[PDB]
UniProtKB/Swiss-Prot annotation:
The gene is GRK5. This is G protein-coupled receptor kinase 5. It comes from Homo sapiens (Human). The active site is at N307 (proton acceptor). Residues 18-35 are annotated as: Interaction with calmodulin. SMART domains: RGS, S_TK_X, S_TKc. GO terms for cellular component: cytoplasm; cytosol; nuclear membrane; nuclear speck; plasma membrane. Residues 445-510 form the AGC-kinase C-terminal domain. Residues 182-444 form the Protein kinase domain.
Amino acid sequence: MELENIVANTVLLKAREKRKGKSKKWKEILKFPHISQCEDLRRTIDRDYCSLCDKQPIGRLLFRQFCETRPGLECYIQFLDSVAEYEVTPDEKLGEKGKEIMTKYLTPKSPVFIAQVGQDLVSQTEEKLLQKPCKELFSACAQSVHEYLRGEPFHEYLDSMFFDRFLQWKWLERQPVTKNTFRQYRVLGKGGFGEVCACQVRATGKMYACKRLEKKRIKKRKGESMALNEKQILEKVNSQFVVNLAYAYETKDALCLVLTIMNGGDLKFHIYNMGNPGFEEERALFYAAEILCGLEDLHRENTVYRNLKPENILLDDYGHIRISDLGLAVKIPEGDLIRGRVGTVGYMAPEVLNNQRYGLSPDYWGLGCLIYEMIEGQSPFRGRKEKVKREEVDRRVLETEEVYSHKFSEEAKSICKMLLTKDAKQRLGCQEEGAAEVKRHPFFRNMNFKRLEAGMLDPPFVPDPRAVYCKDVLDIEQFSTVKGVNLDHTDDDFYSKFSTGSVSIPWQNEMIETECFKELNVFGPNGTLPPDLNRNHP
Ligand SMILES: NC(=O)c1cn([C@@H]2O[C@H](CO)[C@@H](O)[C@H]2O)c2ncnc(N)c12
Ligand SMILES: [K+]
C-alpha cells in the first residue's frame, strides 16, 4: 500500500464531513458592507419580482421574512406554501388535502382568508374540487396571487430594510473568486484539458469538484471554443441530473469550472472496479431513468451531448446521478445537422463514425450503450479488457449487431435494440416523439417518471459516506505535460470572457446551505435596523 494513496484519501474524507470545514475567519470574510457602499448595486440590479423574490434564493427568503411582518401578506405566503403541499400530495389524498386548503383560504370568514384572488375563481376551482382533484387545480389561484404580490407588495419589499439587506448579500456575491477562495484536495480524475479535483471553499466549507482547464493545453489543441462552450452550457442547463456550475475563474495557469461534487464515484467504476462486473437490473433501471430525464432536459435546451459513457456519469451521496463533461456538447441551430468525427471509441453513433450530418440522434444511441453495459457488464461492441485497434470497433458498430444473454430481461433486451438501431431514422426517441417514446418502453415499467423527476424515488444503491468510489490517487492517468508553449496576450480576452466569477443563484444557495446566510442574516433587536444598514449615524 502506498502512503501517497492512503493520505490522499483520508484527507479528502475529513473534509467531506467542527465548523463543517469552514475557515476560522468566515464571519469577517463574509461581513456585510455598510449599505452606503451598495449604491452601484442599488442602481444596476434589475427589479424583477421572480428573480429578486423567488428565483434568487436569498432574495426569496428575505422577501418571505419581510412578508412575515405584514400579517396581510404572511397568509399569501402560507397559501402558496399550502399549494406546494397540495401539489405534492398523492393522487389518492389529493381530494382531501384539496379540502383543508379550501376551508382555510376561501371562506370569507376563513382564518387565513385571502381576498385578492377573485370570488369567481374560488367557485370555478371549488366545483373542480367537488368534481375531481388534480395537482394543477390551484394553478390559476396561485397565479392570481402572484399577480398581486408582484404589484404593491413587491415595491414595498424594495423600500424596506430587507431589500436593502439583499443588496449587501449581492455585494458579497459580486466578490472576486481566486485560488484562495478554495482549498485543493486529492485529484478525482483526468479528463479533457486538465484534472478534476475535490476542493472546498475556505469561507463556507462547501465541497465542490474543480474541473481544471489547463491553458497551455487549450492553446495547443485549438480547443478554445470547446472549453468555453462547456462553461456556458453547464451554466444554461439547470437540471437535477446534470452538474450545476457554481464558480468560473482564471488562475496563473488554468481556467476553472467549480461543479457539484459527486462523492459516489462514476459508474464506469461501479461496473468494473467493484464487485462483480455490472449490477442487478434493478440498479440499471433507476439510473437509466435518471439519465433519460437528464437527456430530455439537455434536449429541451436544444443541446446534444455526444459524450455518453459510464465514466462521465456520476453518483451523488444519496444514489442519484448526474451527467458530467459537457465539453463535447453543442447547441444546434434549429433545422440543421452537424458533421463531427468526435467522441470516444465505441460510444459513437454510426452517424458520428461516418462523418455524417446528425441531430439529437447520437444521444439515444449512447443511452442504449450504457444500459447494455450496466447489465451485461461490458460494452455491447467491445470486451472487458479487450485490446482492439479502433478500426474494428468502428467496423463492429456499423456492421455487426449486439449480443444479449440471460441476464437481460425481455424488456431490457428490447429497449437496447430499439435504441441500438443502425438506421437513425428508426431509432427509439429519435422520432418526433423524442424522449417521450423512450419513457414508455416497458423496460421503464413501474417507473413513475413524474415521481422520479421530483426525487421521491429512493436510489436502490446508496454509496457509503466513508467510501471514496474512485481509482486511487496514484492510479490516475496523467498527461505528457505540455511544454514549450507560450501564452500570448491575444488570449487574455478569452480568459476574461471565461472567468465570470461566481454564479449568482448557486452562490446564494451555498450561503444558505452552509448556514452562513442563517447565521449572518440577522437584524437589530425588535426587528430594527442594524448598524450596517443605518445611514443616519453608526
Ligand atoms: N466535472 C466532471 O466531469 C467530473 C469528473 N469526475 C471524476 O473524474 C473523472 C474524470 O472526468 C470522472 O470519470 C469522474 O470519476 C467527477 N467527480 C465528481 N464530480 C464531478 N463533477 C466530476
Ligand atoms: K458491481
